[PDB]
Amino acid sequence: VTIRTRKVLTNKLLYRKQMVVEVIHPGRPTVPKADIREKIAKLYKTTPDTVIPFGFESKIGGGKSKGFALVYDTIDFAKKFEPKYRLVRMGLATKVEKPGRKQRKERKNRQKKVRGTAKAKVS
Amino acid sequence: ARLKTVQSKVTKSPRRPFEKERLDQELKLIGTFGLKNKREVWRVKYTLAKVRKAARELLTLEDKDPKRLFEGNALLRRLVKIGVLDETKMKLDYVLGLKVEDFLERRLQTQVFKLGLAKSIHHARILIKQHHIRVRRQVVDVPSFIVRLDSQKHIDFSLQSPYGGGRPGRVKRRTLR
Amino acid sequence: GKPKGLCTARKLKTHRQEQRWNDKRYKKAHIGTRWKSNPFGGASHAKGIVLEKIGVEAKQPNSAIRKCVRVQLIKNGKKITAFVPNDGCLNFVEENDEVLVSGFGRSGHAVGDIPGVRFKIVKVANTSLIALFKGKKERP
Amino acid sequence: HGSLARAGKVRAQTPKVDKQDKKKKKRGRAFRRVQYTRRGPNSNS
RNA sequence: GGUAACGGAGAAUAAGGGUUCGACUCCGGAGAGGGAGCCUUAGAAACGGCUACCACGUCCAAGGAAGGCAGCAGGCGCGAAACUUAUCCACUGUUGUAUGAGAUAGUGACUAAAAAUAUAGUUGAAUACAAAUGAUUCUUCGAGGAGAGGGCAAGUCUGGUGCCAGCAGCCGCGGUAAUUCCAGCUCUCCUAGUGUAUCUCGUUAUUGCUGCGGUUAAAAAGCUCGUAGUUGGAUCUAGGUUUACCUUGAAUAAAUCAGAGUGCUCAAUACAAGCGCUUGCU
RNA sequence: UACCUGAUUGAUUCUGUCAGCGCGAUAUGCUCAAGUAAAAGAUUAAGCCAUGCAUGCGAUUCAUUGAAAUUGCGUAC
């Protein structure tokens, strides 16, 4: 389960680092992203929650695999420049339960028909 | 919105569907190099004919033409790196001498049984299909896969195959259990 | 002989266009009444209803009665005669039946010893006539 | 002569016969190999 | 006057010269059921803005009030002919939470590339994603289409019918001893594809500019004059002002066609990528 | 790959077409182990549409963070 990093760019104006991470697990299945995260954190002597492996696709027959990684200066910048879904995936943030777009669009369409403060009441 | 995806054909059907000479010759070629269908050989014939027609179009021009130089050197280079054209034969006036057998020999399916990795060409094909061959640490399951000169010497058994080192096959596991 | 002057392009082109109309293929494809005269209206297939069934005396020296069916196209209501291929397939065609019909092969010309018949049935009652002959299916 | 009512006469008169069973012929490369090894082809008389 | 006509970039075929097409992802134009008239505005004769008429609908308590999917998804019709009344701004842009633009999944033998039947699936894991499915890793178990007289590759084998049934693009088979039908048995082509129908191009020097033919096969006007058109004799520095034409440059959106490099496993494709070592170079 | 082949005759050579033959478009028959890209109500009816969506977001906050409303902007892309 050797990890290697290439193409490293330090994004101070995004307070992180961007690389390409390659994991070698011949015979074994694809690496768990948590294990990749731990190995990258040990490599870069920084917190394991401030490292983001993503887009990890494996090659045929096991062995080689490639997926990108974002190592962040601080958790503030991590959950400052990032989409919510990644933070939900790794547990940093949480998913917000929201109605489907069909239902929400119907709600707003009916809310259009009604004027004043009854817009909130109608549902 | 979305664009037109770019496609291109590689096989051109013969003008005469039936003639004993071509039929027998192509059957003999299929036998010599294990292929699946006549489209396989027409693909090689049409690649060869593209090569030859481009070379002829080039030779219609004189020797030191910039386009002639670039294209001829590139084409001789590609054929060399595949291992079809001879590396002491550097000219299009000589590339106008090739045959389908040359390209067909540069298929993985041939090299497998050639270098002793399989007994028959059929055995070679079924081994590649079952993922028991590897190339430069790369399990290629494509019999028509094209083996360059460099990769010519970089094929051995798969690092996971029971025959290349790994768990016993299904029959062996059944017997053990 | 044809004109050969360096400034006779108009004459050459006009003469060629004028003489193209004396060509059967060009005239057939550019006449303008093709759609009105052709039962299928330029299509390859059509649908219709059966009216009656006929036997046509095959031309000399052949002796046989070819079993065709008179059909009415749904697109335009025109009456045509369509051939029913394979043996004992007229049985699978009953009066007042929906049929898919196609060309016979010679692009509006009769084929073989069947006189005046230029279409052929490809499906009856939404079934393939070949399937009906081969027993792969049965009359709905 | 022809009467338009004798349809299916020959296939109706045709004596009915059954089929025979044969080992599933080899498919694809095996068929090509078998044909090559076997190499008029159907000289009955 | 006609067009079963939006123009172009282009597409198919293709020695050369061409023939045909181009509703359609880009550019320009037009339209929002058919007309007409306008408000607002920088910009509209706007229609997911209004006003009126015509055609056709919708709700009414009959006093009234409304509608414009040639936007996305679906429905009816028309037909030979064409998909889910799905999820999302996670990606690509719009000034940016909003975006049926846009991006995801569904049906899909349009199609392009790559490939199992000999020597697939399945259980649960690991990956991906806005969520997902399916792809990429481990582990449990665990052959069909046409054909077989010639054109054209491939049977004068067996029984029935006796020009009937049928086959057959064409020539042609079948009339009581059928290599062509109906069966049965056999083989050939191609191959997870292979037939059929209509149409385009080649074949076609059977539209001929290159490049046809006109005594008898189709084709020289009965003959002459004649305007337009077409075509027009030789001749100006060999020696010891205008044009036409040819050469080279300028201005000439991409996508496609031709064309370098690069193992996305190959290829269609795509425009990637490839080395050190971590704070990197090309 | 600058290509032809069958058919008028007792037989022959021509003219000439018909047929065959290769590609492509559309439809359709039979059949189809799994996967990757991927066209897709143009052709006829610019025919008619149930139902859902497709255009909404700085100044003005005594409602409970920001609702409602007025402006501004856009909806001519």
From Swiss-Prot, chain B:
GO terms for molecular function: rRNA binding; structural constituent of ribosome. Signal peptide: none annotated. Coiled coil: none annotated. SUPFAM superfamilies: Alpha-L RNA-binding motif. Pfam families: Ribosomal_S4, S4. Residues 106-177 form the S4 RNA-binding domain. One of its GO terms (biological process) is translation. Component of the small ribosomal subunit. The ribosome is a large ribonucleoprotein complex responsible for the synthesis of proteins in the cell. Part of the small subunit (SSU) processome, first precursor of the small eukaryotic ribosomal subunit. During the assembly of the SSU processome in the nucleolus, many ribosome biogenesis factors, an RNA chaperone and ribosomal proteins associate with the nascent pre-rRNA and work in concert to generate RNA folding, modifications, rearrangements and cleavage as well as targeted degradation of pre-ribosomal RNA by the RNA exosome. This is Small ribosomal subunit protein uS4. It comes from Caenorhabditis elegans.
Swiss-Prot record, chain C:
PANTHER family: 30S RIBOSOMAL PROTEIN S12 FAMILY MEMBER. Component of the 40S small ribosomal subunit. This is Small ribosomal subunit protein uS12. SUPFAM superfamilies: Nucleic acid-binding proteins (SSF50249). GO terms for cellular component: cytosolic small ribosomal subunit; ribosome; rough endoplasmic reticulum. Belongs to the universal ribosomal protein uS12 family. Gene3D superfamilies: Nucleic acid-binding proteins. The keyword Ribosomal protein applies. GO terms for biological process: cytoplasmic translation; translation. GO terms for molecular function: structural constituent of ribosome. PROSITE patterns: RIBOSOMAL_S12. The modification Hydroxyproline is found at residue 61. Keywords: Cytoplasm, Endoplasmic reticulum, Hydroxylation, Ribonucleoprotein, Ribosomal protein.
